[PDB]
A paper describes a structure:
Among the >600 human ubiquitin ligases, UBR4 plays a particularly important PQC role, being an essential and conserved E3/E4 ligase found across eukaryotes. The architecture of the E4 megacomplex is conserved across eukaryotes, but species-specific adaptations allow UBR4 to perform its precisely tuned quality-control function in diverse cellular environments.
To explore structural differences, we determined the cryo-EM structure of CeUBR4. The functional importance of the ring architecture is emphasized by its conserved shape and dimension in CeUBR4, despite pronounced differences in its helical scaffold and dimerization interfaces.
Residue numbers in the entry: 657 to 883, 891 to 1187, 1306 to 1396, 1416 to 1510, 1520 to 1771, 1933 to 2337, 2349 to 2358, 2372 to 2401, ...
Write the structure that this text describes.
């Protein structure tokens, strides 16, 4: 019968715990203790357990009643622990703010559960409840019975005096502890009885309160095992923080763990069941407490005075953490983000190691902790769980299919930012690990290297960038590569910590010959790729470490073939990434037939990035690119409409930081601006009736302006024309639309005159598109009001007001349905035309032109869109447009092979404006939306997981802080792996490292770090500096130069090629230390030096006109060096160097090269003037302290002198370049040849080439370079060459004036004479005897020849023309910052020369003709300052 009562009371407890009505309540259960007395089983000890179970169930029922919740939607233990959470003395210690917080949170979750429920029980609850929390709802009748019998239970709970409750491991003891402190349902009599029995159990009060507190926290902890958990976590942290203020300095770790709950026993439960399905609550608690104490510690670090209490707190928590460290390793869930929390373990170790005493007393624990931590990295289940994780996603782009192996998004805001932070874990190992940890790690790496390499090579076909990553097995590849990389890096770091050799000779060679790019930029500390610090290593026990390292090195001999194979695969991937021509051709050709094209809206290729606060017609903002990578944003302000806002932003180091730091400027505009358009580098502002045009400089400063004022016909649209780099004739065509007509303005012909005007027959314009064909003809398509599309093409260009009736109509889209036309767009990259009408949109491929009389046939495809769309923008492969009937949605188009990806996005706010932009790091496409309110801007980006960058013409770059800042390509994971392999090889096996480094030397296919380690490896391989080392290096450089031929325009990447040529030009300098070897390499590669100079000349033309100065300087420097050092092709080399000036394809560049020479000569002086001073200081010094280089290359032309101090690296250089006595004089025979052939070129040049500007003529530049060269020769040389030049002049006057072929040659020679006199003038300061003798000889020669008479004859013919006939159009290129005809300019130039010559003759001749003064005064009256100064000097 006893078992029957056990079952009855158990069923009673279960049924009440679920709040379910049963017939038992109708009985008089208040005297249930009477019932048991009827049978007589009240003496049964086994029934009291079920009685206290009944009491517990009634308690949780009471908690449910107070909560006003009802229903068994929460487990029994949750509510039970929530009951123990109440007004019990555990919350006598809590403060008001946390009380408000917890009340608010439980109210919010209760309200959420409430609105989760249906209506009927909602009405029942609302009727039942008289108030919200914490007021108890209304009291019914049956709860009174339940409570009354609950309190009456106390009668059976006598159970003798103390002996029943002496057993601590009983349920009745837990109940007794619960009633003693604060259980609400129990009345005060029961509470005082419970307090009395506890006093009998524990006479003292200290242990009483200790066990009460421990029970409370252990209950709050044990309740968190079987899923409001976040709130309970938070209040646990709050209770711990409160209690931490009462910890004594002499407390034991066991007592402190007791105060925290059952902490030591809670974390020591290592069982499979506990690990399975746990939410990692233990590590959450440990990390939260550790992070709070770490924030406290780091806050106390910066203070000036140490706070004893805070230090005591941190110390006690550190002791606890040290005691428990060896247990927390087991808990991280392999199927969760185990590695993230493994990395997050950094703070507890930091605060443990802040105190050296704790770390010293706990050494074995720390070592075992780190050993298991490392063992976790190679465990199979952990790796499989990480692979199966849904947050591990590998980036996939269009060029690099998956070869980049990128797994980190810097702009992802989710909690697991770094799912696989192996580097942070290894850095922690390096920072705090001891010697034994390093030994274990080295052994494990040695064992695992071969398997890791084989697993990598299993997926070589996917490391080569041929296919993408699909399955979860293939992701293993990434989990290998990173791991392998880190292993090697770790090895290298430990080597640098334990071995001290520093040979200093390889560094000496690399510094002397400047083979390293960073050293070149320094001479014209560094941070390594892997940086780990060691703080717990002892140097007295190094030897065994060395042994381990040696073992690892031997392992490298067994795995080198696989490493070479993966290096080959990665190089193949890098080379393949830059070949995009065929993909683009296929994409463009795929649109030829409209029968095989679809529109897909299933792919989301644009995703939001971030909303920030940085700053009808919606074309109010646009962007312009600058040369140095900075960006200029132009926009129309709202407050003032008579100004234009310009913002300079620097987003090549970070987008967010770059947009934060803005440079604001205001440009005043005459009128209010309605619309804004930008093409390339110029912009058009559309006002009410007039419009404005601006053109900017490459530095971002405004250069050119043009204000144009034009029934009713206001301005509708206006846009520039697409410019072509191939078109030398740069026409600034702009099309302006008005409701009746289209006008075309050409800012290179006339500002107030339009080339053409076309008026619509019976319609209204809505949009106009202008297209610049390659032939030169310009196509224009205009969208009428009815929807008709009219196409015209222009072939002849004249600034004549012509009017045309538009009568060419193409097959209109949507036959017999077309609404009112809305917009037109033309994508030049894809050769596509978008037409947006009222009823929908259409796309077509622009067909080849046929004529001005017929009409072409268009094939149209519907874009699966109906609403009208107006504002269009285009960037790298990406088209965007703004729908007009709605103020929230944007549409994005991306054409792929035979399809057009479409995405329609909507934003919750009304949009003001937007603009597209290609990232300054060249890795994604951004779209910035500008709003009026406080969140001023939002930024969207191309989706990270699948980036569509087929049409981006650069590789990702960054401004890395090597503060020094350098533009370097992004270091992918594959290249990091390659660099790690190479560095480990240079450390371990030198022959293999040298053999492999010779393959990775091209700078256009490899990261700078890879090239640097390859050069270091090659240097180390050759210990004796010979011709072979420089032969290898300069062969790589010269092949890089030679490869420029194949990199034509259709090959794609344009900006990368430009920066690549700049890099080559910067690297050219270092050759000056090995000149004979470089000459030999040049001869063996190109055959002849003239071929190399021809290649440089060919590359000069392709460069933009405002950047060609650097390579002109390079050509001048190399030619001068070759001539100075002596070559057997001097004649042909000078021949081509001069032919550059006068050739049909290069004469426009003459003005550049002259300036280049005028720089080089100056640099030459900066050499010579230096060397002379060294001759002085060395006069009273030992002869064995300086050296003179006899084969200096072009070192003087670079400003470096030929006299260098005697140092070991100088000895290295002199061993190669040879030396001569320091006091040796100079030789200028090469200059003699240069001048002689320049003079011959001037004389034999073909004349009668008319010019509008004489300062840009080739012959003027040749004369100027002759003068600059003669300014440094020996005085006897000047005398000889000037005397030779003088006698070539023919002084016949009728034979040289008007137009004769000899006339222009004579003019050129006379100009040369004037320039040489100008040069000779400044030498009057020199007081040398030879200088005076040469000056007097030249003056006497000029007097004897008698050119002043010739000046009179020329002036006598010049003046009559001045008496007879004598008294803002944009340039094709951006301007850097009377007369009427060719004859008039020729006469002006003749006057200038023929007046300048006698003035210089008079000035130089420091030892009154009537005709002279008469002609001078007369011509002065006709004209000016030259005449006045000439008469003034005559007087």
């Amino acid at each position: 019968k006893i078992e029957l009562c056990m079952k009855l009371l158990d069923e009673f407890a279960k049924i009440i715990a679920i709040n379910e009505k049963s017939l038992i309540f109708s009985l008089d259960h208040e005297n249930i203790l009477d019932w048991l007395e009827e049978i007589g089983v009240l003496d049964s000890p086994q029934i009291t357990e079920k009685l206290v179970d009944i009491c517990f169930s009634i308690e949780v029922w009471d908690v449910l009643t107070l909560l006003q919740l009802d229903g068994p939607e929460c487990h029994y233990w949750d509510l039970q622990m929530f009951g123990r959470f109440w007004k019990t003395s555990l919350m006598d210690l809590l403060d008001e703010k946390m009380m408000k917080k917890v009340n608010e949170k439980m109210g919010s979750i209760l309200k959420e559960q409430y609105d989760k429920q249906s209506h009927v029980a909602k009405a029942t609850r609302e009727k039942r409840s008289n108030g919200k929390f914490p007021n108890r709802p209304k009291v019914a009748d049956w709860e009174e019975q339940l409570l009354l019998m609950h309190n009456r239970i106390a009668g059976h709970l006598t159970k003798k005096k103390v002996e029943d409750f002496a057993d601590e491991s009983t349920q009745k003891f837990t109940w007794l502890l619960g009633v003693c402190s604060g259980q609400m349902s129990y009345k005060k009599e029961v509470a005082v009885d419970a307090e009395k029995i506890l006093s009998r159990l524990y006479p003292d009060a200290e242990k009483r309160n200790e066990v009460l507190y421990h029970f409370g926290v252990s209950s709050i902890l044990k309740g968190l095992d079987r899923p409001l958990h976040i709130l309970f976590m938070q209040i646990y942290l709050d209770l711990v923080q409160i209690d931490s203020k009462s910890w004594k300095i002499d407390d034991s770790v066991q007592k402190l763990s007791r105060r925290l709950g059952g902490f030591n026993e809670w974390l020591m439960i290592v069982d499979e069941e506990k690990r399975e399905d746990d939410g990692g609550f233990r590590i959450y608690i440990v990390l939260n407490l550790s992070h709070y104490f770490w924030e406290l510690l780091e806050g106390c670090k910066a203070s000036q005075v140490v706070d004893a209490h805070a230090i005591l707190k941190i110390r006690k928590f550190a002791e606890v953490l040290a005691s428990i460290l060896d247990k927390i390793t087991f808990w991280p869930n392999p199927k969760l983000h185990a590695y993230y929390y493994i990395a997050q373990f950094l703070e507890p170790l930091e605060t443990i190691f802040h105190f050296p005493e704790i770390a010293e007393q706990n050494r074995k624990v720390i070592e075992s902790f780190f050993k298991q931590l490392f063992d976790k990295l190679l465990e199979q289940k952990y790796q499989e769980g990480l692979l199966q994780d849904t947050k591990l996603i590998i980036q996939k782009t269009d060029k690099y299919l998956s070869s980049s192996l990128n797994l980190f998004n810097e702009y992802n805001t989710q909690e697991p930012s770094k799912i696989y932070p192996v580097n942070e874990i290894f850095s922690l190992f390096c920072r705090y690990g001891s010697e034994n940890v390093h030994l274990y790690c080295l052994k494990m790496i040695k064992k695992s290297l071969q398997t890791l390499a084989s697993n990598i090579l299993e997926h070589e076909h996917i490391l080569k960038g041929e296919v993408c990553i699909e399955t979860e097995l293939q992701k293993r590849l990434v989990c290998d590569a990173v791991l392998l990389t880190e292993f090697f890096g770790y090895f290298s770091c430990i080597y640098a910590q334990v071995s001290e050799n520093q040979p200093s000779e390889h560094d000496d060679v690399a510094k002397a010959f400047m083979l390293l790019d960073s050293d070149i930029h320094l001479k014209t500390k560094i941070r390594n790729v892997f940086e780990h610090r060691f703080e717990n290593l002892n140097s007295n026990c190094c030897d065994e470490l060395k042994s381990a390292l040696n073992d690892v090195q031997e392992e490298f001999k067994e795995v080198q073939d696989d490493l070479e194979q993966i290096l080959e695969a990665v190089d193949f991937a890098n080379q393949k990434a830059l070949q995009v021509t065929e993909e683009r051709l296929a994409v463009l050709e795929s649109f030829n037939d409209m029968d095989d094209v679809i529109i897909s809206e299933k792919e989301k290729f644009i995703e939001p990035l971030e909303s920030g606060h940085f700053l009808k017609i919606r074309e109010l903002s646009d962007i312009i690119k600058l040369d140095d990578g900075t960006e200029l944003l132009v926009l129309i302000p709202e407050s003032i409409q008579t100004c234009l806002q310009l913002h300079y932003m620097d987003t090549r180091t970070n987008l967010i930081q770059g947009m934060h730091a803005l440079r604001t400027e205001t440009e005043q505009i005459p009128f209010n601006a309605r619309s804004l358009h930008v093409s390339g580098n110029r912009l058009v502002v559309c006002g009410q009736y007039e419009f404005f045009a601006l053109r900017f400089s490459p530095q971002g400063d405004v250069i050119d302006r043009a204000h144009i004022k034009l029934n009713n016909n206001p301005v509708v649209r206006a846009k520039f024309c697409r410019e072509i780099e191939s078109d030398k004739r740069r026409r600034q065509l702009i099309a302006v639309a008005t409701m009746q007509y289209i006008r075309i303005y050409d800012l290179t012909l006339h500002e107030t005159n339009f080339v053409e005007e076309m008026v619509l027959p019976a319609g209204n314009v809505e949009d106009v598109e202008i297209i610049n064909q390659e032939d030169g003809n310009v196509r224009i398509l205009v969208l009428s009001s009815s929807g008709y599309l009219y196409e015209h093409n222009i072939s002849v260009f004249n600034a004549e007001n012509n009017s045309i009736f538009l009568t060419n109509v193409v097959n209109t889209p949507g036959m017999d349905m077309n609404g009112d036309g809305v917009s037109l767009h033309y994508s030049s990259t894809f050769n596509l035309l978008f037409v947006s009408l009222e009823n929908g949109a259409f796309v077509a491929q622009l067909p080849e032109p046929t004529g001005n009389s017929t009409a072409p046939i268009y094939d149209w495809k519907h874009l699966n869109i109906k609403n009208p769309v107006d504002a269009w923008k285009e960037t790298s492969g990406i088209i965007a447009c703004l729908s007009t009937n709605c103020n929230h949605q944007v549409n994005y188009f991306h054409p792929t092979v035979g399809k057009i990806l479409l995405q329609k996005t909507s934003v919750k706010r009304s949009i003001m404006t937007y603009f597209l932009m290609t990232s300054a790091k060249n890795q994604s496409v951004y779209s910035v939306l500008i709003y009026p309110n406080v969140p001023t801007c939002e930024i969207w980006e191309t989706s990270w997981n699948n980036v569509h960058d087929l049409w981006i013409d650069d590789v990702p770059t960054e401004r890395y802080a090597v503060p020094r800042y350098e533009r370097q390509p992004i270091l992918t994971n594959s290249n990091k792996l390659v660099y790690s392999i190479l560095e480990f090889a240079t450390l371990s096996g030198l022959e293999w490292a040298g053999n492999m480094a010779k393959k990775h030397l091209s700078r256009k296919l490899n990261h700078p770090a890879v090239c640097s380690v390859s050069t270091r490896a090659i240097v180390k391989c050759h210990p004796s500096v010979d011709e072979e080392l420089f032969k290898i290096i300069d062969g790589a450089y010269l092949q890089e130069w030679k490869a420029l031929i194949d990199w034509t325009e259709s090959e794609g990447f344009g900006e990368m090629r430009l920066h690549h040529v700049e890099q080559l030009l910067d690297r050219m300098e270092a050759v000056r230390t090995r000149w004979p070897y470089f000459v030999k390499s040049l001869k063996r590669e190109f055959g002849t030096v003239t071929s190399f100079v021809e290649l440089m000349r060919n590359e000069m033309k392709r460069m933009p006109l405002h950047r060609c100065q650097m390579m002109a300087q390079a050509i001048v420097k190399i030619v001068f060096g070759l001539l100075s050092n002596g070559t057997n092709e001097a004649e042909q080399l000078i021949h081509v160097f001069l032919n550059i000036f006068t050739d049909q394809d290069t004469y426009h560049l003459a003005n550049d090269m002259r300036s280049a020479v005028q720089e080089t000569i100056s640099r030459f002086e900066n050499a010579l003037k230096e060397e002379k001073k060294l001759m002085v200081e060395h006069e009273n010094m030992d002869k064995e302290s300086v050296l003179r280089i006899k084969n200096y290359g072009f070192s003087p032309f670079y400003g470096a002198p030929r006299i260098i101090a005697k140092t070991p690296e100088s000895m290295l250089i002199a061993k190669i370049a040879e030396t001569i006595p320091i006091d040796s004089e100079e030789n200028f025979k090469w200059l003699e040849q240069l001048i002689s052939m320049i003079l011959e070129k001037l004389t034999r040049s073909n004349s009668t080439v008319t010019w509008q500007n004489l300062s840009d003529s080739p012959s003027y530049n040749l004369s100027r370079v002759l003068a600059s060269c003669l300014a440094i020769c020996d005085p006897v040389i000047i005398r000889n060459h000037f005397s030779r030049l003088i006698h070539i002049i023919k002084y016949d006057v009728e034979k040289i004036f008007p137009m004769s072929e000899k006339s222009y040659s004579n003019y050129s020679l006379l100009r040369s004479v004037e320039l040489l006199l100008f040069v000779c003038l400044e030498k009057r300061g020199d007081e040398s005897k030879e200088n005076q003798e040469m000056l007097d000889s030249i003056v006497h020669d000029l007097q004897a020849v008698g050119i002043r008479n010739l000046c009179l004859k020329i002036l006598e013919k010049v003046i009559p023309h001045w008496k007879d006939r004598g008294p803002k159009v944009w340039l094709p290129h951006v301007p850097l910052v009377w007369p009427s005809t060719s004859e008039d300019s020729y006469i002006i130039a003749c006057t200038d020369l023929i007046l300048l010559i006698p003035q210089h003759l008079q000035e130089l001749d420091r030892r009154r003709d009537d005709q002279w003064i008469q002609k001078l005064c007369q011509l002065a009256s006709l004209s000016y300052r030259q005449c006045k100064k000439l008469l003034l000097a005559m007087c």
